[model samples]
Target: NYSVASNVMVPMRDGVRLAVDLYRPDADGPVPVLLVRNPYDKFDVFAWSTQSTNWLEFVRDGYAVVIQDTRGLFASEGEFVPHVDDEADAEDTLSWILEQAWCDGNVGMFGVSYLGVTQWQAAVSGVGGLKAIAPSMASADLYRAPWYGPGGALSVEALLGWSALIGTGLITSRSDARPEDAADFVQLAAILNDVAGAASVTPLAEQPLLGRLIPWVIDQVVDHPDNDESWQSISLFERLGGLATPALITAGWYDGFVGESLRTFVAVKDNADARLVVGPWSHSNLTGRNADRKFGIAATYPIQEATTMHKAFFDRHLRGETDALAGVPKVRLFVMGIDEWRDETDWPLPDTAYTPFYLGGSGAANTSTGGGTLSTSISGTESADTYLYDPADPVPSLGGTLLFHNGDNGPADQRPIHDRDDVLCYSTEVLTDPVEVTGTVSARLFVSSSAVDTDFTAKLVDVFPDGRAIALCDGIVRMRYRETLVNPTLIEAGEIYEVAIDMLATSNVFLPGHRIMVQVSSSNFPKYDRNSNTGGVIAREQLEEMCTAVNRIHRGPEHPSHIVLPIIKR
Candidate 1:
């Protein structure tokens, strides 16, 4: 029979008490511990196995699992402010674990996404006896990866959808809210209910009329739009150097935080024991299925293996076992095209041969201008193209990996986005052979926007022989944050400036007959809230849409805007 432990309230340093549900092994030996702190409902039984046959998974493995509701969230008593990291609360929780009777002195952490972020929070706070952690689908640099900034672009669908899901249970203890992703109380109900409309105000999860923190939410999130003191305050890279615990990071190329996972591997590789596992799934796939029968890559695992893997990893680090992490690569990736796994010594493998293709004349960089030579000159530093971006009719979402169930369900399609006049497409000739690229893909754009504040969104794509331009890595930058996220400088009219988009890190084999493609545009509306171009605070702006701006992308000697590809020579 399985055992159950109900609502245990633990006090945080701030005097706020959070609720936790403890599941211990029935055998009762001092065993290793696996702890998870999340903002989601801790009582959601489907989230874990606490009864029946599944209980054996943890008990049989000599470990006790504790799931905690983050401070100010369901069952927890505190003023809920989203993405606060609550380091003080985590320290108290770890202290409690150290005092637990069913546990040994060692403890480990595991969770997906928000839960995963908690593990990072705990590690950053330098919690005692916290041996190791496996945080799947997690991110530390919100602007650098998840929300957009690496390149000047927007993550339209993801930002909107997620804002809705996590905004549920708005008032009670279970009420989890974050200012960065959701609207304030005045706008919450409408935003949640009418997301697609211009005046749309779909609620993040669910809006509770009783929740009255509207003013607080307004001040916290709406006041800061760019990378300011608030965002930098929570950056993991800023202080992760002090964390010495071993890490087992997980992500999916299709997941929202894949870039962060890769970054975590890089940021901590030289300092700590790090191992990264990438699956061909979304934020939810680490412990479940991600099916694509056509590609012959269907996720098939006993969902429990996900947690078991984490348990084994912790046991090995805390209990002195060796097999849990033997012969693992510093980086393990899921090759999407083939839908298979491969081991690599490092990201953007060293010794990758460089390849560049210049944007030829007639202003036709698309397929119609075939046979153009690809040279290092393609890195635009001299001349640029000017395109007028209108917000009236925005770019619609299309195929090429998406974050949720509704993405890319059909054949390779870029039709919805390909013909947009505002989007400028520049593609290279079809490759004669397969080219494997892994590393950070970058776009150096030298241009000036007519608007003092605007956006630049870049997308890396793989154009197939059939004209299906499947999207690969993408990035966006709010013009104001070009130089640094900390302080944004609004573009002066016609003032030339450089915006280097991170494009982040990615690994893929752009197959023969596949043309490397690039899409540069201004707005990815709804995905990322419209940039207004009028330069107002992100949260509380006037209803009127701002003026259209002319964006000039130069690729000549004087002004060069080029894309950097890390090509691996086969």
Candidate 2:
């Protein structure tokens, strides 16, 4: 009289058994195994199981589901190696699935972000029985997609939040911990997770794991900040075209990995069957729900309806059923402001036009009253705005696309950031009509720093009438990698240099009466390790020796600093 789900454990290649849960439809005939590798515990009693949200949609459509703990995490054995290492371990587990009597020869993978990464790794191996993969909010390159800028600078917030949470926060996430141990470690884990419990976990900040493992991970990344083959091995960008199976790629304008998904779609558009869907949500975007209404004119879609389409995708390939991907626009994006979904012919939206908003002001003051324009500039500008970036008193972080901090509670308030001197804000006149800006957004800055090398950050904001300017996209760069991410080029003292920082991709409609704002600064603190003015490898720099640097932003024709946007027709 009821549908059933079973909890079980499977052993990995190294003898570590992982905890897993199996859910089967009431009427089953060895249906294809829909595998889900989750970072959350396999035994988590949470109702929003991947099955209910993404996989159950498939199960009811006539498929069996399998959810697992990626190794060394949750009920799994061994240690969590992070990223692809977890992927490799999951592949071994998937192999075990094919051998099971209940599973048919065909298997498909589905999950979000980290779970998506596991699916890609298995796909790259070209494993047997692996037919297709549906990766949402997942990117191939860790460097390019979620945690760091393409050029190697850390995504101060994402890096500090995700790694620590996954690495040390797991200490409390395990179900095996004793009650006292769980309670004791909960606050620390939350701090490492940088979640709501963060305030209650200040004492745990002294924990050895966060203080040590986090710095170590950051160091390993910054130590090798280029796109060479060495870096490419970890990059999904290299193998997008090589993927043999069809993929239903999904992303969100406010999601950290949106660019990675968009780039993947473009890479495989000519050779592979990739259909994309973008929504108006943040990371872990499922379409139906939203973190906050502050998204303004942005639209949202129902998760159940969207997952239904995904079911059709797998059914078409795995079971030979037709649903949404047939004779439809390959790309479907959620239009912000209007709060609706629309079909498109191509990315950057085919109907859109490129617009460059040139930045300018009195050569003297970088202040808002100095004057700034959103027009075109062919050459560099002589006039500039100057500010001191103090390591001690750094710019505050705000909401938008982030992993470490939780937005599940509410939208990020910009009031805390407005009072900070380290940050300089610029805004545009509210649109008289709805302005829909979609695709990739980039910032070009002419800079000169007192230090031989440092870091620069830019944030794109949606200025609401209530004085709330929510972040949409952002980027950062360690000055040394200004020219090439692989090779470090030290900036000469007092010498002006041009640095282009990509603020990722987004599709938001700035409603009439709403404003567009851009903020520039040098440091974002704990989100990104403070840049020590002294030129040296980011990882090896002594925190005690870190000092403030003077940063100059040029805005004249000779130093035209502005944002390039992709605008779509209403």
Candidate 3:
């Protein structure tokens, strides 16, 4: 049914040879190409099987499928530097593909995660012959949401886990392990096991598993503490305006990169021929049932077939068939809680009402049993809540947009974490009517810390009538990097500083009997690296140097801290 060009070495301008496998239909003259540029091995059938569509489907659809290995991965030459050099590499690959006789001069790129990163990288290069792209669950800003998080907190487990995955290839190809693939096997074992243990290792530069297997992880640790030219080089935030190609962005409500995905869509929605499709999914389980529960049969996107949506996107752009995208909505969002889907004309529906819910407590909002109220009116004048935050006893992360393999990544019961005294839980009264929050969620706090620098974390949870608290979205803010990533402003020890913590975004409904809850704490553990109160260099801080800081959240007529929810009235 198809012909294969195996292990073709494509040369870049820098004289680096990248390995690629080309599959084409047997009866094709010159056909439009569907390119997937990724670092996860071009020939890994098992790995490719997990994708939404297979290469054979593209071949059967009369499109040439080209899978290429990223530089320095597998059989490719040059150093394996992540995120960097992708723009140049992708530009070179597209140029090479257009010159080939089998190419029809129109090319479309598709893939999820890092492969999606490559698409954005190439698109921003203003490359020719690139007609369209479908980047699913991709990161828009490496320094912000997915990779480093909003407040400059490093994603401990996810960062090291990915490094370990790439480190296996680096180790196996560079040095001789016992058997030929012993290094690969060992790295695979590390990935399968508790990679969080490696993340917990102090002086992150010396993590036993990642230190030796992937030494480049240390360089990344040192390079991205602050937003600079290095982060901006790989970031798609500012470059989105330059993207002229049609795009189909796919994401999941529970996916780690969902925030970045939405931000990217909003940036390019009016400028380009952009479409969005988001479902109830995590980073690892797209088009499948999540870890704890199922989102029903309709949860999966492309309801007609496996590759229907992607086929429509490419066919419409590459083949100039306008009818290919006739039925698909401009913005398709999977509304959770009700387990239904909705379509809109844009990223955020225009009728969204930004509502503020104030936090009220009697200075004892410790655990779930503590008395903490969230309401519309704040009659009280002077009430400040304080808590002791010990870095050694930081609150554990349960589930809410976490990417590491240590804990459940998607929505999970927050009852286990609510029992901790370190976490402050504030809940609203049972709603008489349903409240639908559809856009970004954020919390503004007037806080003071005993230490020069610390962190403040916020979470939005849906409290069921049955007393089940499920996390919807969460975020953290390191006090030093509160104002901007470029500058560090350490707080005057006990002086209150007003800061805003962006808790990503989510679309969910609170039923008539359900209550909207917010959790405030110091840390979310290995999901984010714990901030040491001592204010030393983060990556180099030792466990012994950790200090206990007294944190205060002020609520009064003068300092009214509140959480803002974008409620959409039906």
Best by lDDT: 3
Per-residue lDDT of candidate 3, residues 371-446 (tens digit): 7878777628667777888877778777777665644447777888888877988989889998899998899998
Clashing pairs in 3: none
What candidate 2 gets wrong by more than 4 Å, as runs, is: 1-17, 26-28, 45-54, 167-207, 211-233, 284-301, 322-324, 363-370, 377-381, 406-416, 464-467, 539-544
Q: lDDT of each model, Cα atoms only?
A: 0.63, 0.67, 0.80
Q: Candidate 3: list runs displaced more than 4 Å.
A: 170-192, 287-293, 301-306, 407-409
lDDT of 1 by residue, 140-208 (tens): 776554554454343544544445445545533223545633444445455454444522232222223
Clashes of 3: 0
Root-mean-square deviation of each candidate, in angstroms?
A: 5.0, 4.1, 2.2
Best by TM-score: 3
A best-first ranking of the candidates according to their TM-score comes to 3, 2, 1
Error of 3 at 289 (Å): 4.4
Return the TM-score for each candidate structure. Answer: 0.85, 0.86, 0.95
Query: For candidate 2, which ten residues in a row score worst on lDDT?
Result: 196-205
Per-residue lDDT for 1-570 in model 2, tens only?
Answer: 116555577887778788788877666456777888877666663633432355556667667788887776776777665664665666777788888877777888877777776777777766768877888778877777665666466555565466555654466664676555555455446565554333222222233444454454434454455555555666666776876677878787767677787777777677666788887666644333443454333344355656767777777777756564576567888766666778887775776677777765444333334344455454355666778887656665555665556533123556567656556666676778777788888888888999998888887777777666666777777788888776677888799888988777777788888877777888764445556778865555545666678888877666768888788786
